[PDB]
Amino acid sequence: THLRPYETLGAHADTMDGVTGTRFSVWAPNARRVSVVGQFNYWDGRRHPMRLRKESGIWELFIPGAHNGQLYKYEMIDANGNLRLKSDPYAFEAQMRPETASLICGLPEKVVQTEERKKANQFDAPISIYEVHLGSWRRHTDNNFWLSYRELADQLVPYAKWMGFTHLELLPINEHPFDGSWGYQPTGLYAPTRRFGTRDDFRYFIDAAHAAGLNVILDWVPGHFPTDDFALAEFDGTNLYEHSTLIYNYGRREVSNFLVGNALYWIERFGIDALRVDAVASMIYRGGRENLEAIEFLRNTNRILGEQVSGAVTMAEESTDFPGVSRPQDMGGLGFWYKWNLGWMHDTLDYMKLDPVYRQYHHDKLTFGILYNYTENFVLPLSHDEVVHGKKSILDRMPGDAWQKFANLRAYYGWMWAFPGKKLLFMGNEFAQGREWNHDASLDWHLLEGGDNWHHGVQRLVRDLNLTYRHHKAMHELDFDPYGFEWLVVDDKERSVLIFVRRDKEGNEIIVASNFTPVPRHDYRFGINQPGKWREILNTDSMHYHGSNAGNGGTVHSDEIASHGRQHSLSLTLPPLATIWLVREAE
Ligand SMILES: OC[C@H]1O[C@H](O[C@H]2[C@H](O)[C@@H](O)[C@@H](O[C@H]3[C@H](O)[C@@H](O)[C@@H](O)O[C@@H]3CO)O[C@@H]2CO)[C@H](O)[C@@H](O)[C@@H]1O
Ligand SMILES: OC[C@H]1O[C@H](O[C@H]2[C@H](O)[C@@H](O)[C@@H](O)O[C@@H]2CO)[C@H](O)[C@@H](O)[C@@H]1O
Ligand SMILES: OC[C@H]1O[C@H](O[C@H]2[C@H](O)[C@@H](O)[C@@H](O)O[C@@H]2CO)[C@H](O)[C@@H](O)[C@@H]1O
């Protein structure tokens, strides 16, 4: 069992014959002697030296009297012959920047994954993710301070739950030194950032999300090698972890254990339910373009998780059309369960950006997503990458005056939530923030203060979209099966009306129709598959969302009148810049 190196390396409480303390391990094959320097030592590297094992390269020692809560470090003389005070690379807890000293804590008890949390991860479940940067979601008013893990527990959790999300997704909670990396430049892979409290506080947070029936996804960064505070480079005077631009040595067997351990750790000692790997492209590129050993790392890691912690899943963002990212290793490979649908994000946003008068020439931007839908298990993501650095907010991409911007954005969420593939939405998007995301400030919650306005409208819509999406299997059962989606009207470019059906395993279908110009369509007849009585269950133009409240205003019965190659049809009102969903009424 060499998969969980965190259960042996680093600081672990133990008792050597009646006397208790903590036994330290590391791993610096070369090094040149290493001692342990903590609060128990008066910080003196002459009192405690460590005995090196030759085969494993691990220096070890059992200090009695040294207890949980005490800072410590490693004083080593490196291959070159230099004085170094290194941070434990298996630090489960670190100190407030500035800026290193590891802390003596052990391992959290350990979380058995529940059946219901496993069910929530499956390809047939509704999965709607709220993506959040913990340092910019909310702040206290007086002082602009972070909310702690426990405060986030009282506030972020009840909020995402009420908004009807199934998953919470966190930007990296890796200890990281600069708020500006957003957590993507780590220096302590096994310690939750101290920014928001203790590691037990982080754990309580996760327990609370679960108690509310949310799954939790963690951004995992085994692909960004540490580059700050000399935290991991030339560990023992040699290129222990990196290579001869700093990039992990996924080939060396102990580096691999390190990274795979890290995954098993989050999932097993915190109960994390899934992990997301960013920038997969820059892990596998730069023997062909490909970095063969990096590809193997991911295949392997996925296999190991699939075997060790089945029920947990992995997702990936990969920026080139690398085949089979979310397909099994015996074949394509990589072996992720889910892939970010970046192509969709770009196509649909480019579509929404157009002056509606020009949408008739870019219809392919909305239809195209179906052609490659069954090549990958997709998540439709409106993530943090899309609302920084001059890209604008999602709202601000929309054309026209304010009332047309909101309407476009409503119609789009309508479409997004009905279109095959899971859902991801970055905080602030749900209430249509105007400004870009600022990791250095709270979101613009002041937009929701005072009388009911257009921002509340969207927030209500997103909630109703989640709850409605979760209620009806057709919207979510068969994302990844051709049977789950079928065009009713794919070729109305000249009016920019698009209509499809979603379908569950039992063959029940929901009709989804979108009108992407501001011209209301009345008596719009299209062919259908299940004749009978149809009723709106969702309408982005409802006054409940500050729409004009146009629509069908009741049950509508189909006619036996051929249309679009079908024998029966519906003749509906399609509100301007809106999408609606209809269900069939039992008789
Ligand atoms: O790039 C490949 C492909 O893209 C474009 O084809 C479009 C079709 O013109 C359009 O009808 C639609 O195709 C749909 C089918 O009609 C429908 O029955 C179902 O089977 O799948 C499609 C749903 O998206 O969309 C595609 C993509 O925009 C382009 O115009 C073609 O020349 C080209 O072969
Ligand atoms: O429909 C896509 C494809 O995905 C699944 O395979 C998963 C597998 O469950 C995991 O072990 C891991 O390796 O990810 C794989 C995809 O990368 C389905 O089981 C499979 O039937 C399906 O073809
Ligand atoms: O974060 C909670 C806080 O949000 C709002 O105030 C924000 C403001 O909207 C931001 O643009 C920025 O200036 O930070 C402020 C808080 O530090 C609400 O107005 C406020 O009531 C709410 O508690």
Structure, explained:
This protein has 587 residues and is an alpha/beta fold. The chain has three domains: 107 residues, Sandwich (Immunoglobulin-like), CATH 2.60.40.10; 358 residues, TIM Barrel (Alpha-Beta Barrel); 106 residues, Golgi alpha-mannosidase II (Immunoglobulin-like). 21% of the residues lie in helices and 22% in strands. It is built from eleven helices and 27 strands. It has an eight-stranded parallel barrel, surrounded by four helices. The protein has a six-stranded antiparallel β-sheet with strand order 20-21-22-27-24-25. It has a four-stranded antiparallel β-sheet with strand order 1-2-5-4, with no helix packed on it. Helix 2 packs parallel to helix 3, helix 4 packs parallel to helix 6 and helix 10 runs parallel beside helix 11. It is elongated, with a radius of gyration of 27 Å.
Question: Tally of extended strands?
Answer: 27
Helix content: 10-25%
**Strand ordering within the main sheet:** 10-11-14-15-16-17-18-19
**Each distinct ligand:** a molecule of 3 linked components (GLC-GLC-GLC), a molecule of 2 linked components (GLC-GLC)
CATH topology of the largest domain: TIM Barrel
Content of β-strand:
15-25%
CATH architecture of the largest domain: Alpha-Beta Barrel
Task: Tell me the major beta sheet.
Answer: 8 strands, parallel, barrel
- Overall radius of gyration: 27 Å
Helix count from the secondary structure assignment: 11
* Separation, N- and C-terminal Cα atoms: 60 Å
Shape: elongated
CATH class of the largest domain: Alpha Beta
Instruction: Supply the CATH superfamily name of the largest domain.
Output: Glycosidases
How many distinct domains?
3
Structural class: alpha/beta
PDB class: transferase
Keywords: Branching enzyme, maltoheptaose, linear polysaccharide, starch biosynthetic pathway, transferase
Assembly: monomeric
Entry title: Crystal Structure of E.Coli Branching Enzyme in complex with maltoheptaose
